[PDB]
Curated annotation (Swiss-Prot), chain A:
Function: On ligand binding, forms a receptor complex consisting of two type II and two type I transmembrane serine/threonine kinases. Type II receptors phosphorylate and activate type I receptors which autophosphorylate, then bind and activate SMAD transcriptional regulators. Receptor for activin A, activin B and inhibin A. Mediates induction of adipogenesis by GDF6.
Subunit structure comment from the entry: Part of a complex consisting of MAGI2/ARIP1, ACVR2A, ACVR1B and SMAD3. Interacts with MAGI2/ARIP1. Interacts with type I receptor ACVR1. Interacts with BMP7. Interacts with TSC22D1/TSC-22. Interacts with activin A/INHBA.
Name of the protein in its database record: Activin receptor type-2A
Glycan attachment residues as annotated in the record: 18, 39
Residues of the whole record sequence present: 26 to 111 of 513
Curated annotation (Swiss-Prot), chain B:
Entry similarity comment: Belongs to the TGF-beta family.
Disulfide bond sites: 3-9, 8-50, 37-82, 41-84
Record lineage: Eukaryota, Metazoa, Chordata, Craniata, Vertebrata
Protein name from the UniProt record: Inhibin beta A chain
Covered range of the whole protein: 312 to 426 of 426
Natural source organism: Homo sapiens
Intracellular or extracellular location(s): Secreted
Protein origin, superkingdom: Eukaryota
Swiss-Prot record, chain C:
Organism of this sequence: Homo sapiens (Human)
Oligomeric form and interacting partners: Dimeric, linked by one or more disulfide bonds. Inhibin A is a dimer of alpha/INHA and beta-A/INHBA. Activin A is a homodimer of beta-A/INHBA. Activin AB is a dimer of beta-A/INHBA and beta-B/INHBB. Interacts with FST and FSTL3; these interactions prevent activin A interaction to its type II receptor. Activin A interacts with ACVR2A. Activin A interacts with BMPR2. Inhibin A interacts with ACVR1; this interaction creates a non-signaling complex (NSC) that inhibits ACVR1-mediated BMP signaling. Inhibin A interacts with ACVR2A.
Protein name: Inhibin beta A chain
Location(s), subcellular: Secreted
Lineage: Eukaryota, Metazoa, Chordata, Craniata, Vertebrata
Gene that encodes the chain: INHBA
Full protein stretch here: 320 to 426 of 426
UniProtKB/Swiss-Prot annotation, chain D:
Family assignment from sequence similarity: Belongs to the protein kinase superfamily. TKL Ser/Thr protein kinase family. TGFB receptor subfamily.
Coverage span on the entire protein: 26 to 111 of 513
Quaternary structure (record): Part of a complex consisting of MAGI2/ARIP1, ACVR2A, ACVR1B and SMAD3. Interacts with MAGI2/ARIP1. Interacts with type I receptor ACVR1. Interacts with BMP7. Interacts with TSC22D1/TSC-22. Interacts with activin A/INHBA.
Its job: On ligand binding, forms a receptor complex consisting of two type II and two type I transmembrane serine/threonine kinases. Type II receptors phosphorylate and activate type I receptors which autophosphorylate, then bind and activate SMAD transcriptional regulators. Receptor for activin A, activin B and inhibin A. Mediates induction of adipogenesis by GDF6.
Glycosylated residues (UniProt): 18, 41
Disulfide bonds: 60-79, 80-85
Species, as recorded: Rattus norvegicus (Rat)
Subcellular location: Cell membrane
Protein name per its UniProtKB record: Activin receptor type-2A
Length: 91, 85, 75, 92
């Protein structure tokens, strides 16, 4: 049955959230997942991960990939359960 | 209901957050769907206008004043369906 | 001139066994609008919380959006 | 101002939610925030169904205590305003 994703809140404490685990999405329209991180000086700092609502840029995307070139906060979108566990980057 | 060509149509239009100046505070997505309702509507029994009858939310990854990243599912930011009053 | 009239509704009146709470909600409805055509339509909406059933004894609680009319205006 | 409330989900598992704890109610610009408790007092024993935040209802206005009003329902419900107000519930 429909959509479940990897969750992750870098700021979990102040926000009184879980730091990680898995989030189950609700919505019939498509259900995606995302991943936001930082790639500054040889270090990948996770920002957030969770359920993402019907964004076309996220359709038929089985792999979570960041397409933008020189960003401060990276982002990738994807369709398919737990697809956000792994994330890459191109341009 | 579609909108290709008269009657209560839902025109589909995309908008870049850059073309509005918001690209700096909004990380994702890069834009949204500014859809509107245009079309002629039958007569009542008073009047009837082609208005939205359905709103859907959008997910955003943006910075708030305190330079800290938020992810919220913004409600009613997309016009999904049009109908007559 | 366009005016926000206050119409309240009920649930057994229409779901009394479906929705646990509330019993009803201040719904409201929309007046005269001038010349391009103008109709007195809702311009502002509020969500409302609901405690009802899923489908088969499953209790749920969600904040349903655009269910209350807050402020009307001209198209 | 801010409003927090006791959270609860008897069905937290299938739903993949914490079973209890607090929940901070975030809401509308100038609208009021309340709290709710739902349960089933069927045997003489009380069953917690759910407990959480609640968005501006009038049935909750200015009620400092969570009191279930309706007589003999299959599912009791109570509405109150003011932090953690839903921890303690009753019927009347």
């Amino acid at each position: 049955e429909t959509r479940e994703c990897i969750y992750y809140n870098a700021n979990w404490e102040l926000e009184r959230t879980n730091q990680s685990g898995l989030e189950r999405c609700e919505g019939d329209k498509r259900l995606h997942c995302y991943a936001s991180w930082r790639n500054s000086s040889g270090t990948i700092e996770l920002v957030k991960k969770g359920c993402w609502l019907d964004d076309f840029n996220c359709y038929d995307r089985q792999e979570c990939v960041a397409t933008e070139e020189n960003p401060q906060v990276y982002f990738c979108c994807c369709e398919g359960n737990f697809c956000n566990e792994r994330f890459t980057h191109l341009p | 209901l579609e909108c290709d060509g008269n009657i209560c149509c839902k025109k589909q239009f995309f908008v870049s957050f850059k073309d509005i100046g918001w690209n700096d505070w909004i990380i994702a997505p890069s834009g949204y769907h500014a859809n509107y309702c245009e079309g002629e509507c039958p007569s009542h029994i008073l009047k009837s206008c082609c208005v939205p009858t359905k709103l859907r939310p959008m997910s955003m990854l943006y910075y708030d004043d305190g330079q800290n990243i938020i992810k919220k599912d913004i409600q009613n930011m997309i016009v999904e369906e049009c109908g007559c009053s």
